[PDB]
Design a protein that fits this description.
The structure is a homodimer of 810-residue chains.
Chain A (H helix, E strand, L loop, with lengths): L9 H18 L9 H30 L3 E5 L3 E4 L2 H8 L2 H10 L4 H5 L5 E3 L3 H15 L4 E6 L7 E5 L2 E5 L12 E2 L5 E5 L2 E4 L4 E4 L2 E13 L6 E10 L8 H6 L1 H5 L16 H23 L7 H4 E6 L6 H12 L4 H11 E4 L10 E3 H7 L1 H21 L4 H7 L2 E2 L5 E3 H7 L3 E4 L2 H9 L3 H6 L4 E3 L6 H7 L2 H11 L20 H26 L8 E6 L8 H17 L8 E6 L7 H17 L9 E6 L4 H10 L2 E4 L11 H7 L3 E4 L5 H8 L5 E2 L4 H10 L3 H7 L1 H12 L11 H9 L9 H15 L2 H13 L6 H13 L11
Parallel strand pairs in A: 1-4, 1-13, 4-12, 13-14, 14-18, 18-19, 20-21, 20-23, 21-22, 23-24, 24-25
Antiparallel strand pairs in A: 2-3, 5-6, 7-11, 8-11, 9-10, 11-12, 15-17, 16-17
The structure holds ligand M7C (2 copies) and pyridoxal-5'-phosphate (2 copies).
């Protein structure tokens, strides 16, 4: 149908049709009479999968022959979403499969909706890993993603009576056609036990064993015939485990619980034993696999030349002491040589400065679970602190500040400190964040080892986040500048020479209108909710958190509503305000915020005087597949975190690429987005980092804002008095109390500027032509935020490998 | 190579080779360089599976169109063993696959050894279900096996220091290529809750729900293109189950434990809640599936015309009250009509008279778990006892004897009584057993309803138990009488006219010698144990149980050893005595018997004076795949249960078919085997049922035998004094105490006759020609013991359907 979706050749369509029928018959054991719509999805999935296999085998044998330096990306989260469409896009099969399925009397888009999201992540951190895998494959790097195959991913969110309810995401129910179990590479992982000191060295004995069974999932690069591997480990009990008889077999579940469920917390450290087991499990299995692959190319001097290990935050930080353990205890290297190898192999990425997110493990837990690792951590700490003491003699407070061991009521290991000590590179994920690391939380470490600290601004893959989710936009762009931009996103700059092109302006606006109509329909079909597609689509989708300030958006919404009620016959630009995202199950305030949003919707959406001028919708079960639908439909992107709290953000980049304008604070990557597009083409408001610091020095007093802003006072009085909860007048008392007395994120301080900035948004939306021209200026300068750029920088500046767009033979 | 294994045509071999390479590439994602031997097995398995699919689909659509009466065989056990070779045999692909794999540089028999047994049964009861499925398919019946897909089957037995150790049988580790998950037919199963009485009727409310997910496995008939289905249910928690968050997800394991593990008991009732849950789980899911299929052909008068339900013992007896529940509570039929339908639909097979095997469920368990079923059982009991009272007025003791409810310290439901009341047919599994049922434990029921009681003598499938495991014998038979006997085993009678044929005698003996050499090699390879292949192979393989009297065999072995030690320079016929079988994990005496057998081996096998004249080997991990190896190798079959205890036996029939002579008591099917072959061609010894009864009336005094038999006294003194356990002199004190004071199975009473009979065995073995002629007379009269005969009888006399050998189109 459209060019960017590839050719629909006669032979390929014919071959796809017969392979589809082959899988329906032989693989699914059905015929067309009893075939369910899900059967048709699986037949298509297997058919597309067949086209991956040759390239997958060829890629991996190519790496075996050439023996390039291997990149190992260790993460507890990989938020992959759906795989079918992405695979077709990257193999240039989308039009062929569409034609083939159409000829068999099936709608391919309907089949695509049957696939479950692989929701093995919470949000930005997990999705970044996913985008990164795509870019590493597209850039021809010998890269492997290593993680845990959770039986249950992020929970499905149901809204009941305006409240979040969680239900288990049983994503493997119907099977996963994309993965291949590799039981032959099953490896043992040890827990508990004790350390014995022999004449030869330390030995870790009397351990409990859990098996790690790998499942491999293909990661196709964009039309370069590269197919890399994501290897996810599943926990298995050994056959002699606990070996009355029946109970012993049933107790195998204990060992296998390690890979059962993803911890559902975003930017929050929960110091539970099961989480620690997961962290060691992935690290121990992965490192054995790495070393096996290295040996099968004795001399570990070359280890850092052939291996790079990227730690996705501190979650896999045990790789550092585990690598030391293997090198010292098993391979019998001397400490100093092992440490050199470890440091040169490992690099660490920090993703947040929020103090509640930092991993600080109780010593007593490590003592019991990983006794040898604790000993190694103590030794690392002693040698590291000796270096600090020699560099800064007499500075005893520096020693205690930099220690891996935090003293106190309960002693804890600071895993960030461990990572910095044991890595040759430490990076933040946006320029402002990386500077904050050097000036605040890692200041001492930067002073000791400045060369170690880098920036790598985050990015998103333009395959999933433009071509896949917004084919209409990708097409009208391709008509002007060709298709090269899909793997070279900087070429979008060529679109600046079309900002005054009348045809292009009309096409850009038409694509957005189409996306909005399609999404408005989706809302009525799958959720029976009615919206005006001519309204400004005002969207905030991301995890629910105080720092992200969904509450500030809520205050604006209520302000708009109150202004309409005061002057009902005055014209206002119609808006559909959409907010979506999951709250961590134990995060009370986040759950209260969800309830507030739905309660506002209940009032606003049923007020006859408002009409269809203001609608407030909570988007249920926000996830990657929903992001692919809503982001192309958005006019306005809400990126309104308190300055200094959002390390980067990546949703911001997705919206910019898809033709939404951004209202936001100078936080995370918003700073660089504004710099790229020009501040005149961004709706910037609010305190800068420096303003937040000044307010903190003086003391944040929310009462002052309440006293001086009448519109704000009215809203707080409405909340307190039960205007939005008639039958439960005190329902939102916790929210009001927090805002007035314990608001860490200064919602009131940015309220006035936010509301004024929102008026400037509405003003511009009244002039479609100039709105669209500003949009073109955003899309045109979004190139920097391709994860291809990000990964090229990791490759050159951290891993020491050169990327390549050279294709492998098909 | 050999005729009975089918044609190896050029096209078929070519097509098999390319499909093998296709699966290796696309399905296993490997090439020949990194392909493990297990990968080659799976490629072959998938290739063979492809040839099943067309026939499977065609068979099931044929049943949908013709709408025959459907046979539903409900069992908690299906002991299937391996599937690859059986599938090839039944599809006539064995030679083609052998040729194809040979041309690819692979040994097919080596690949066959990689397949795990599907060990979803304990022994005879489970294996009978397996043989039955094969015969139902071969006889063209629209039959479905329904059971539980246990994650763990019967444990693997390891012998450590002469003791049984159990390890989990993780049979699904590498995947199961034969099964197809059918998540689309997932059904809810209810537990706990309470009964509410409305104006409309009873309602079962506030229940906990577990989901039953079916997996379908194909069951091919012998070269008739029929492929039937075995549907096994797996337990799944619903997604809202227990919905802190993490613990709620982890607690899903509780619900899913229902299908986790097979209860490892043979002929023993263990009244545990988990077992009761398994029993209801299979029944509830199956009945919904049956009713669904019946409705999709309102009026339940025709239900018994279109449905037969065969209860494999009382384990699925809850089908009776469940069917009543559905018909009365949900379909709103009046009680009397529902009962008529239920009785005409259900038939019950009893498999043992051992009192410890009979299911008697505590009322308090049923009360809590299945409150509505208990109410229905009470109502059934009241109406049944009213009939008894009208038939036998004043006979109050009969009423209490026949009651479904047993009064006492704990009230119990007798499930056998429930089954008799609610079935139109009740059968035993061998003539002597069925007569014992009518004379003893079901005497009262036979007097009330004599027409209900039948015999169906057990059988074995000649596909697995001759053609598959003993191709050499099948071939030399086929050379004389053709191949028709494989699905018409009575034709083996034609072999009687070859009993004086010199070529046939030599061929029969040569095949046995080959089998013995092959098995002797297997012992050295996989277990590094050395044996004389010229010795008489004396084999007792079956579950370890007191009633089976492995101990009596032990006494004979020690007698032989003692006689050799007394007269070392006298000639004796050399023997290799092989005993194998698993003990139930909680069965102390059975575990002591295993230890005794190994302890005897330790003494006998290392005594220089014995030499290679006597060897005692314990065959570790006896299972279906091992039976397929050892049974063809055997000369003498030990079937030596105390008269009246082995309901039928089926191992006995396997040995008869494979050219072993039988030493045995007149118990179970041994009686009919002797009758078929002629008593002169069987080594019959010991008490008959009537002799056991006379001894019981008088009182069994083991001391009397000890006092009057010096050779027996010597053995008991050896056991007691520590001759077979030097470092642990009192190790076998429990065994001696049991034999002398608490022997339910009268081991000493048959000792003298057993030993004398064993001398007659040795005497005949000295004359190879006459030994072989007696063997021919056994093989020739083994036809009655084909499960095809058994199933034809069930079909005509119980289910009301006609079997057929007519082929379906390929
Ligand atoms: O740091 C955590 N989660 C994050 N989630 C994110 O989205 C963060 O990483 C993204 C990718 O770098 C950033 O864009 C985002 O700003 C940051 O909050 S960091 C975290 C911390 C502890 C446990 C689980 C997750
Ligand atoms: O009856 C049980 N087991 C049996 N196992 C057998 O092998 C029996 O059935 C066979 C098939 O009919 C008979 O050949 C055998 O004699 C009998 O013991 S009965 C049983 C009883 C309770 C729980 C589990 C199993
Ligand atoms: C991109 C993405 C995120 C991250 O969004 P932010 O606005 O940067 O927090 C979270 N969830 C999903 C499903 C995403 O696709
Ligand atoms: C046939 C068979 C049995 C039953 O043997 P009996 O001697 O009748 O108890 C038990 N186990 C296996 C593995 C079998 O094949």
């Amino acid at each position: 149908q459209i060019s960017v979706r590839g050719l629909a050749g006669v032979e390929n369509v014919t071959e796809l049709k017969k392979n589809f029928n082959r899988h329906l018959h032989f693989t699914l054991v059905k015929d067309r009479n009893v075939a369910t719509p899900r059967d048709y999805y699986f037949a298509l999935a297997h058919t597309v999968r067949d086209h991956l296999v040759g390239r997958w085998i060829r890629t991996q044998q190519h790496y075996y022959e050439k023996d390039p330096k291997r990149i190992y990306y260790l993460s507890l989260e990989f938020y992959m979403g759906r795989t079918l469409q992405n695979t077709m896009v990257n193999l240039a099969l989308e039009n062929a499969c569409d034609e083939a399925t159409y000829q068999l009397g099936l709608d391919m888009e309907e089949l695509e909706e049957i696939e479950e999201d692989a929701g093995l992540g919470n949000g930005g951190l997990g999705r970044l890993a996913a985008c990164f895998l795509d870019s590493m494959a597209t850039l021809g790097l010998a890269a492997y993603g290593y993680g845990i195959r959770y039986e249950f991913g992020i929970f499905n969110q149901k809204i009941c009576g305006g409240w979040q309810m969680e239900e288990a995401d049983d994503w493997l129910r119907y099977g996963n056609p994309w993965e291949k179990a590799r039981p032959e590479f099953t490896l043992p992982v040890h827990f508990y036990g004790r350390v014995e000191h022999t004449s030869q060295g330390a030995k870790w004995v009397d351990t409990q064993v859990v098996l790690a069974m790998p499942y491999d999932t293909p990661v196709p690069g964009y039309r370069n015939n590269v197919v890399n591997t994501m290897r996810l480990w599943s926990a298995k009990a050994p056959n002699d485990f606990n070996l009355g008889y029946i109970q012993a077999v049933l107790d195998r579940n204990l060992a296998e619980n390690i890979s059962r469920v993803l911890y559902p917390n975003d930017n929050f450290f929960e110091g539970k034993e099961l989480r620690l087991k997961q962290e060691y499990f992935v690290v121990a299995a992965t490192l054995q696999d790495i070393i096996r692959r290295f040996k099968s190319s004795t001399n570990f001097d070359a280890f850092p030349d052939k291996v790079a290990i990227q730690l996705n935050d501190t979650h896999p930080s045990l790789a550092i002491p585990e690598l030391m353990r293997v090198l010292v205890d098993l391979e019998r290297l001397d400490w100093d040589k092992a440490w050199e190898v470890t440091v040169k192999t490992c690099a660490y990425t920090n993703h947040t400065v929020l103090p509640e997110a930092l991993e600080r493990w109780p010593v007593h837990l490590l003592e019991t679970l990983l006794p040898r690792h604790l000993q190694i951590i103590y030794e690392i700490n002693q040698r590291f602190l000796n270096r600090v003491a020699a560099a800064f003699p007499g500075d005893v407070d520096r020693l205690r500040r930099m220690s891996l061991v935090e003293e106190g009521a309960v002693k804890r290991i600071n895993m960030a400190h461990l990572c910095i000590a044991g890595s040759h590179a430490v990076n933040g994920v946006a320029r402002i964040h990386s500077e904050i690391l050097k000036k605040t939380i890692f200041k001492d470490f930067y002073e000791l080892e400045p060369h170690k600290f880098q920036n790598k601004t985050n990015g998103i893959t333009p395959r999933r986040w433009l071509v896949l989710c917004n084919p209409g936009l990708a097409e009208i762009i391709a008509e002007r500048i060709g298709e090269e931009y899909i793997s070279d996103l900087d070429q979008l700059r060529k679109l600046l020479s079309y900002v005054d092109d009348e045809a292009f302006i009309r096409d850009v606006a038409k694509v957005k209108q189409e996306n909005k109509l399609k999404f408005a329909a989706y809302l009525e079909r799958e959720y029976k909710v009615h919206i005006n597609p001519n309204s400004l689509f005002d969207v905030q989708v991301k995890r629910i958190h105080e720092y992200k300030r969904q509450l500030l958006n809520c205050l604006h919404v209520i302000t708009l509503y109150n202004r309409i009620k005061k002057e009902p016959n005055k014209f206002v630009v119609p808006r559909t305000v959409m907010i979506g995202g999951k709250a961590a199950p134990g995060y009370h305030m986040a759950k209260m915020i969800i309830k507030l949003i739905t309660a506002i919707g209940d009032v606003v959406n049923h007020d006859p005087v408002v009409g269809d001028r203001l609608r407030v919708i909570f988007l249920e079960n926000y996830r990657v597949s929903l992001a692919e639908k809503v982001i192309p439909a958005a006019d306005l992107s809400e990126q309104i975190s308190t300055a200094g709290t959002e390390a980067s953000g990546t949703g911001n980049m997705k919206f910019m690429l898809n033709g939404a304008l951004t209202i936001g604070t100078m936080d995370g990557a918003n700073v660089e987005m504004a710099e790229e597009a020009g501040e005149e083409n961004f709706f910037i408001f609010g305190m800068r980092v420096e303003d937040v610091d000044r307010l903190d020095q003086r003391g944040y007093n929310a009462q002052e804002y309440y006293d001086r802003i009448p519109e704000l006072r009215q809203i707080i009085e409405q909340l307190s008095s039960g205007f939005f909860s008639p039958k439960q007048p005190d329902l939102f008392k916790d929210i009001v109390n927090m805002l007035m007395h314990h608001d860490r994120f200064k919602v009131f301080a940015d309220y006035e500027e936010y509301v004024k900035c929102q008026e400037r948004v509405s003003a511009l939306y009244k002039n479609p032509r100039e709105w669209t021209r500003m949009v073109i200026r955003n899309i045109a300068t979004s190139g920097k935020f391709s994860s291809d750029r990000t990964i090229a920088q990791y490759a050159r500046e951290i891993w020491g490998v050169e990327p390549s767009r050279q294709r492998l033979p098909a």
